[PDB]
Amino acid sequence: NDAQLKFANDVESRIQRRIEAILSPIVGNGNVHAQVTAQLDFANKEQTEEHYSPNGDASKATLRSRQLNISEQVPRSTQRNETSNYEVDRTIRHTKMNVGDIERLSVAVVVNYKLPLTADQMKQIEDLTREAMGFSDKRGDTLNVVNSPFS
Amino acid sequence: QFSEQVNYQRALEGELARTIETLGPVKSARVHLAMPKPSLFVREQKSPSASVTVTLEPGRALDEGQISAVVHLVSSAVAGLPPGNVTLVDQSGHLLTQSNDAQLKFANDVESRIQRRIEAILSPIVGNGNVHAQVTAQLDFANKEQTEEHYSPNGDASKATLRSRQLNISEQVPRSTQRNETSNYEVDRTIRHTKMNVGDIERLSVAVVVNYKLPLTADQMKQIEDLTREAMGFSDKRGDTLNVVNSPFS
Amino acid sequence: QFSEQVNYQRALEGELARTIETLGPVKSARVHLAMPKPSLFVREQKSPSASVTVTLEPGRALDEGQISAVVHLVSSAVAGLPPGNVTLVDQSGHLLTQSNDAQLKFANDVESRIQRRIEAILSPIVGNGNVHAQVTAQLDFANKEQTEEHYSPNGDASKATLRSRQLNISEQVPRSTQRNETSNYEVDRTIRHTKMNVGDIERLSVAVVVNYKLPLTADQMKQIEDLTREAMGFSDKRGDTLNVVNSPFS
Amino acid sequence: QFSEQVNYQRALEGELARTIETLGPVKSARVHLAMPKPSLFVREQKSPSASVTVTLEPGRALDEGQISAVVHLVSSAVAGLPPGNVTLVDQSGHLLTQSNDAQLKFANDVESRIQRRIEAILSPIVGNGNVHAQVTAQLDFANKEQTEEHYSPNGDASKATLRSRQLNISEQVPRSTQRNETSNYEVDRTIRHTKMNVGDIERLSVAVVVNYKLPLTADQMKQIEDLTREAMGFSDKRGDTLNVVNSPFS
Numbered sequence: 001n002d003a004q005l006k007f008a009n010d011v012e013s014r015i016q017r018r019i020e021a022i023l024s025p026i027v028g029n030g031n032v033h034a035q036v037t038a039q040l041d042f043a044n045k046e047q048t049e050e051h052y053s054p055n056g057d058a059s060k061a062t063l064r065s066r067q068l069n070i071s072e073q074v075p076r077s078t079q080r081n082e083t084s085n086y087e088v089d090r091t092i093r094h095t096k097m098n099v100g101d102i103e104r105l106s107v108a109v110v111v112n113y114k115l116p117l118t119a120d121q122m123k124q125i126e127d128l129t130r131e132a133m134g135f136s137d138k139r140g141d142t143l144n145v146v147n148s149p150f151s
Numbered sequence: 152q153f154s155e156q157v158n159y160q161r162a163l164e165g166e167l168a169r170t171i172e173t174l175g176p177v178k179s180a181r182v183h184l185a186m187p188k189p190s191l192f193v194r195e196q197k198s199p200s201a202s203v204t205v206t207l208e209p210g211r212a213l214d215e216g217q218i219s220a221v222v223h224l225v226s227s228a229v230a231g232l233p234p235g236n237v238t239l240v241d242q243s244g245h246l247l248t249q250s251n252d253a254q255l256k257f258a259n260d261v262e263s264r265i266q267r268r269i270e271a272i273l274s275p276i277v278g279n280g281n282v283h284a285q286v287t288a289q290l291d292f293a294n295k296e297q298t299e300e301h302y303s304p305n306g307d308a309s310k311a312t313l314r315s316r317q318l319n320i321s322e323q324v325p326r327s328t329q330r331n332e333t334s335n336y337e338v339d340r341t342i343r344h345t346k347m348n349v350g351d352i353e354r355l356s357v358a359v360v361v362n363y364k365l366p367l368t369a370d371q372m373k374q375i376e377d378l379t380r381e382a383m384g385f386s387d388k389r390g391d392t393l394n395v396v397n398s399p400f401s
Numbered sequence: 402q403f404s405e406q407v408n409y410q411r412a413l414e415g416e417l418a419r420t421i422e423t424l425g426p427v428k429s430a431r432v433h434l435a436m437p438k439p440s441l442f443v444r445e446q447k448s449p450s451a452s453v454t455v456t457l458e459p460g461r462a463l464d465e466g467q468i469s470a471v472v473h474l475v476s477s478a479v480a481g482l483p484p485g486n487v488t489l490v491d492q493s494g495h496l497l498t499q500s501n502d503a504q505l506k507f508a509n510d511v512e513s514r515i516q517r518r519i520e521a522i523l524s525p526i527v528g529n530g531n532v533h534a535q536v537t538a539q540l541d542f543a544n545k546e547q548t549e550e551h552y553s554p555n556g557d558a559s560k561a562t563l564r565s566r567q568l569n570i571s572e573q574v575p576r577s578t579q580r581n582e583t584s585n586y587e588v589d590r591t592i593r594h595t596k597m598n599v600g601d602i603e604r605l606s607v608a609v610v611v612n613y614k615l616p617l618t619a620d621q622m623k624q625i626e627d628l629t630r631e632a633m634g635f636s637d638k639r640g641d642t643l644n645v646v647n648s649p650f651s
Numbered sequence: 652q653f654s655e656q657v658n659y660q661r662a663l664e665g666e667l668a669r670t671i672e673t674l675g676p677v678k679s680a681r682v683h684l685a686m687p688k689p690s691l692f693v694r695e696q697k698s699p700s701a702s703v704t705v706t707l708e709p710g711r712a713l714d715e716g717q718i719s720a721v722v723h724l725v726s727s728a729v730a731g732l733p734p735g736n737v738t739l740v741d742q743s744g745h746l747l748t749q750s751n752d753a754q755l756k757f758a759n760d761v762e763s764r765i766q767r768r769i770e771a772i773l774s775p776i777v778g779n780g781n782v783h784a785q786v787t788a789q790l791d792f793a794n795k796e797q798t799e800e801h802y803s804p805n806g807d808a809s810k811a812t813l814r815s816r817q818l819n820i821s822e823q824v825p826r827s828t829q830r831n832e833t834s835n836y837e838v839d840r841t842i843r844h845t846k847m848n849v850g851d852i853e854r855l856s857v858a859v860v861v862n863y864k865l866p867l868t869a870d871q872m873k874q875i876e877d878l879t880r881e882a883m884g885f886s887d888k889r890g891d892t893l894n895v896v897n898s899p900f901s
Contacts, residue, residue, distance in 0.1 A: 021535050022533070094545070216494060424742060474704055564837075
């Protein structure tokens with residue numbers, strides 16, 4: 001009930017530490033700080049997908065049986081009855097999702113001056129912290145990096 | 152065939168007392184257990200309990216970590232006992248166990264986490280005591296439930312799935328045309344059973360106050376706003392609100 | 402009766418307390434087992450537990466490894482006891498167990514393996530400490546079930562399989578013609594029962610920094626990049642992600 | 652009555668301990684056997700266990716092969732004790748009992764095997780210390796099932812197989828023609844039951860670095876790469892990846 005907070009704190013601390021571990025040699029031991037916010041999905045998840053594959057094309061149909069009646073006279077009277085018992089592919093997943101994944105991460109990174117770092121020297125560091133974030137575009141992950149002197 | 156069970160349980164009361172007492176900042180700690188007792192008719196055995204009163208070391212109080220420590224101690228000593236039902240009291244009131252209002256404390260904890268993170272991230276920019284914030288958190292404590300039954304639409308015969316189909320066609324030539332078609336489909340189906348967690352953040356509101364150095368530059372201000380946005384985990388969909396101001400402190 | 406099994410409980414608890422002392426940073430360890438009852442009216446079998454409090458050696462602090470050591474000491478000294486039930490308390494509180502999170506540690510171990518491997522490969526090229534990498538792993542802890550029931554398409558009459566056939570052809574000559582046909586088939590079939598693993602890597606993120614010797618030569622950078630891709634086990638399909646940079650350290 | 656097997660236990664503890672004592676690097680063996688009960692309230696009957704904390708001779712560590720020796724001695728002198736159920740601890744810390752991350756262990760084992768093989772082959776070619784390589788292996792731990800049910804095709808009448816056939820051919824001469832034909836075939840078939848293995852490799856990604864002699868020639872390097880492809884067990888269908896490079900060490 002409250003231990004969700006503890007687990008989220010542990011995840012955020014882990015990411016914070018890894019970001020520092022990557023970035024510190026680039027700028028120094030105390031020239032950077034990071035903080036993490038983790039939206040953690042604690043809802044109990046069960047799923048069941050039962051896809052069938054479409055047998056619309058007789059080129060890829062699987063028949064078990066087929067009764068076929070074709071009749072015609074010639075006043076041309078033609079009749080054609082047809083019965084098809086098909087048989088079908090089936091795929092049944094039962095994905096019971098884990099409890100407690102990350103649905104969203106927001107990270108802000110602050111870098112000290114050496115005098116500010118140059119444009120390349122900024123884009124590389126932000127790309128590194130992106131990479132160490134596990135930054136997922138489909139997860140709505142968010143990154144804000146800024147350069148300024150500390151206190 | 153009866154009294155020996157009560158005698159044993161009271162002996163175990165003494166035993167647990169002697170464990171929890173011999174822990175350092177404790178001199179005495181007496182407990183009462185709450186167990187089903189031999190009525191010969193009760194068969195359900197409702198959840199037990201264990202009420203502990205402890206007289207600690209004068210000049211010392213026990214931290215929450217060791218409160219949880221002793222609660223899990225006595226909980227793991229008694230079989231089939233949830234630790235929540237174990238209830239501990241100091242030598243004078245002050246229930247250090249929390250076992251209707253806990254949601255207030257949980258909201259306060261969330262707000263403290265957020266605000267402390269904001270302070271930790273912005274202290275390098277403006278200084279240690281030059282910035283203050285307060286977080287308001289909207290928490291949703293409703294026991295939600297969900298059961299979705301998405302099907303996939305098979306109106307398109309190129310994506311349908313025929314288990315059985317009968318097709319009768321007839322015509323005479325003044326034309327009399329006839330076409331009887333029967334189709335049994337197999338359908339693609341999905342079953343989600345969503346059960347939303349109790350106590351999630353549905354909305355936040357954060358006001359940031361920053362000291363002066365004279366006011367800060369505009370860009371330093373907007374980047375401060377972006378970082379505090381970030382450290383909120385700001386979500387537009389959750390209706391989150393953030394407002395930042397600068398002015399001399401006092 | 403009932404006093405004999407209680408006396409066995411007490412004898413075993415005393416035994417564990419007696420022989421725990423021969424462990425170094427142990428001077429008192431008071432323990433209690435908890436087996437509810439050999440029931441008659443429920444098949445649920447609520448699990449027994451074990452709680453221990455110990456007093457450590459002054460001047461010595463205790464690793465987590467010896468935590469798990471004493472825990473498994475108890476949990477295998479007394480069977481019918483998964484180690485989660487074991488709850489160890491220091492001479493003053495300090496919950497040594499969290500009695501859901503082993504995921505974080507397991508991910509840590511995986512990332513440590515891969516990161517160390519990257520280090521071991523890249524160290525000879527540029528030096529012992531001219532390089533650093535850290536790895537982020539997405540782990541799929543969700544339980545998966547699966548079943549596929551592939552069939553072969555019997556559309557092609559030359560490759561089809563027939564168990565029965567009634568084929569009635571007739572005609573008259575004013576041409577009247579009839580043709581009634583029945584076909585029962587046999588079908589090739591594939592049936593899996595896939596049960597996917599728990600905790601596989603779904604996505605790895607790798608960020609690599611290398612020190613200068615002056616910037617290293619470009620093809621030297623690309624070959625190091627290929628090395629880290631290779632030792633990463635980098636798969637394009639998973640969404641694996643990689644980044645490398647070169648810059649002097651401090 | 653039951654105290655007889657209790658003393659049986661408590662004496663065999665002494666005899667086991669005195670056996671371990673006679674090993675060299677041993678002084679005592681705290682042993683606790685753990686026979687819970689032979690219940691039938693569940694279909695499992697968790698295997699009874701045993702835990703030993705051994706006080707070795709001072710200044711000597713007890714080798715893993717010998718760790719297995721003592722663990723197997725405990726699991727053999729005791730009936731109802733699998734070797735993997737034994738727990739082993741030192742007189743201070745040291746969980747020597749390693750019985751979910753077993754996949755990590757196994758993967759490291761496999762990668763070590765193949766990597767050692769690569770190094771062992773390449774060292775004579777380029778020198779003892781002029782070569783380094785690492786291995787990353789994807790392992791499949793999902794339980795598989797498969798039941799193929801191949802049928803042969805009898806669409807051709809030359810190779811078909813008939814159990815029975817009713818055949819009517821009629822005609823009058825206004826040509827009234829009839830041809831009725833009923834055939835009950837019988838069909839060749841194959842039925843596999845493949846139950847795949849747990850822990851098979853699906854993809855080996857291997858990175859190799861070799862020192863300079865100055866760089867190696869083209870043909871020498873390509874043969875080195877070809878042999879490491881050989882000794883990997885490289886399979887193109889498995890998506891295996893291999894990359895070998897040459898540069899001076901540091």
